[PDB]
Amino acid sequence: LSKMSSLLERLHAKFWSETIKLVRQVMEKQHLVSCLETLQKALKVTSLPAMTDRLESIARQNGLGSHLSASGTECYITSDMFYVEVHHGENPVSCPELVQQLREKNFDEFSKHLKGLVNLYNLPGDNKLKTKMYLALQSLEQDLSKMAIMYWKATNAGPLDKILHGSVGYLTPRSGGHLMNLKYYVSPSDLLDDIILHENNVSRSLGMNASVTIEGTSAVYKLPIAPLIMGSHPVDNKWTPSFNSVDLPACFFLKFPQPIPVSRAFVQKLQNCTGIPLFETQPTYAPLYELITQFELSKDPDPIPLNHNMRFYAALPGQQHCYFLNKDAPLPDGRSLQGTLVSKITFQHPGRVPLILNLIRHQVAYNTLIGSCVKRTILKEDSPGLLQFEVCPLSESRFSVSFQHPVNDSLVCVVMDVQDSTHVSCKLYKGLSDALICTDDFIAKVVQRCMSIPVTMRAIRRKAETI
Amino acid sequence: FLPLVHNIIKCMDKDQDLNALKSKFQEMRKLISTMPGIHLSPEQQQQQLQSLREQVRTKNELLQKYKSLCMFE
Amino acid sequence: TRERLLSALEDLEVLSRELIEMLAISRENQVLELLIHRDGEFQELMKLALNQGKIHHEMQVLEKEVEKRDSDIQ
């Protein structure tokens, strides 16, 4: 509405050379102009000075020292990184990705890449220890590359065994802003989109990743600057004793983009595996049912909460399922399956990563199996069908679903126990006056091929109805 | 017009009236090029075109029916 | 176009002078977008005048046969 007022003021003032003379007189004797330039940067006419201004503005937001030597060749200079486009060493590698964003109008991703390179050095070091700290980092990616090389030497199978059931995970080595990431899981539901071929040209977001890198920590730790792996077993990896090494105030961290709901016993077996406490302070433990529901409701964004009230609805082509998670179920230990959320993992030497990632894989498999019942679909108060299902845990990595007999009147319980990342065993409990329903091996194969409770229930219902 | 903003702010950062001279030059091109401007509006210009299409086509079948009629026995 | 282009091209000129003066006094933000809002529309309007330029050639040729036809029937 200020346009009319501006027009009126302009009309009042419209009733120049004098302004130029006054400015010249001032000239002869801050951030606002930069803000105007960076606001005009988005629509800049494509030309070499325009891209120079765009890059200098990008450096201004990123804090990089904006220094230019020519119109086409520019240098990014900071404490310890130096990149030229047409420190403590030369350019790492002329990766084609950064050229790919630079040659096109993809400067936002270029800015994020620059921020990532800067964030690689968010360390509190004194520019010498920091230097050494990044040198150690190299040693770590060499060690994980050797781990992957050894596992490739173990068997010449596909990357599926590399990701799902194997030491550490699939490698994407660091290049530019993308850190070195490790693939450990893909769900069968996520595997098939709308049958996806898993050739070497796999995307980075196809599933979930597990990055490993260094952040400063409050404690001082002994870390190897030199590569730790020099000798390789035929099929194993052995880590040589450290100390070169020195007490560097940092730690190696494995970063997860999103938190995973993990049980308490997983936490203590994690400190059993590693020894470094995950949480600085004791957090509040809650049953992981609400945690998993909030986690896997985020895979399908919606600003409006569903108001599920622990009564979850599932839509199938022939069946409609009403689910009751039945939280706070009475376990033999006297408590429920308490759980928390994990986002960061701490470790000391590269010999800890395989067991940690195996336990993470097992927990993710169990969580996905439990959360397959979790759906946003609503088919409310439908009188036909609407089978009632109740989930009740029994022990760690164990649970059971109890439901009415599909044909008879007694109850029937099916108990699931997860053995490994892709190993799940199944048992059946039925009354004395009943008929044959299914076999345990069939249920185990269905779980191993789909990893979803509603699909398993559908298969059992169909096989029992066919009899 | 954005390049005008770019080079005037570059000149202000480094060090004129030629910018306003070429802006008035853009004005004289737009005054020359507003003869071909949409004076009669978008709907009328397009409709006029279809009206002339109807006129021309009707002239065509009347003339061809006059030439094609066979009065003689 | 005719009326809108002059209305816009005279807007651009008047607005630009004020911005220079505003820069000059220092050595608002609602008007900086307002220039950009006017900036993003005359470039669309610039090709509108060019599009009708090819249009002008089309209208004149049609009359040619209209007049000769009129003489032919007269």
Determine the number of helices of chain C (DSSP H or I, runs of at least 4 residues): 2
* DSSP strand content of chain B: under 5%
Compute the separation of the termini of chain C in Å: 37 Å
Helix coverage percent of chain C: over 70%
Overall, the morphology of chain C is rod-shaped
Instruction: Give the N-to-C terminal Cα separation of chain B.
Output: 74 Å
Beta-strand percent range of chain C: under 5%
Organism (chain A): Homo sapiens
Family (chain A): Belongs to the Mediator complex subunit 1 family.
Protein name (chain A): Mediator of RNA polymerase II transcription subunit 1
Subcellular location (chain A): Nucleus
Could you please describe the fold and organization of this structure?
- Helices cover 36% and strands 24% of the residues of chain A.
- Chain A is built from 14 helices and 17 strands.
- Chain A has helices at residues 2-13, 17-28, 31-40, 48-62, 96-103, 107-119, 129-154, 159-163, 188-191, 264-273, 288-296, 353-371, 440-450, 453-466; strands spanning 65-68, 74-77, 82-85, 170-172, 181-185, 208-224, 232-233, 236-237, 245-263, 286-287, 311-315, 320-324, 338-347, 387-393, 398-404, 411-418, 424-429.
- Chain B is mostly helical.
- Helix content of chain B is 78%, strand content 0%.
- Chain B has three helices and no strands.
- Chain C is mostly helical and 74 residues long.
- Chains in contact: A-B, A-C, B-C.
- The interface between A and C is medium-sized, with 19 and 17 residues.
- The PDB classes it as transcription.
- Keywords: Transcription, Mediator.
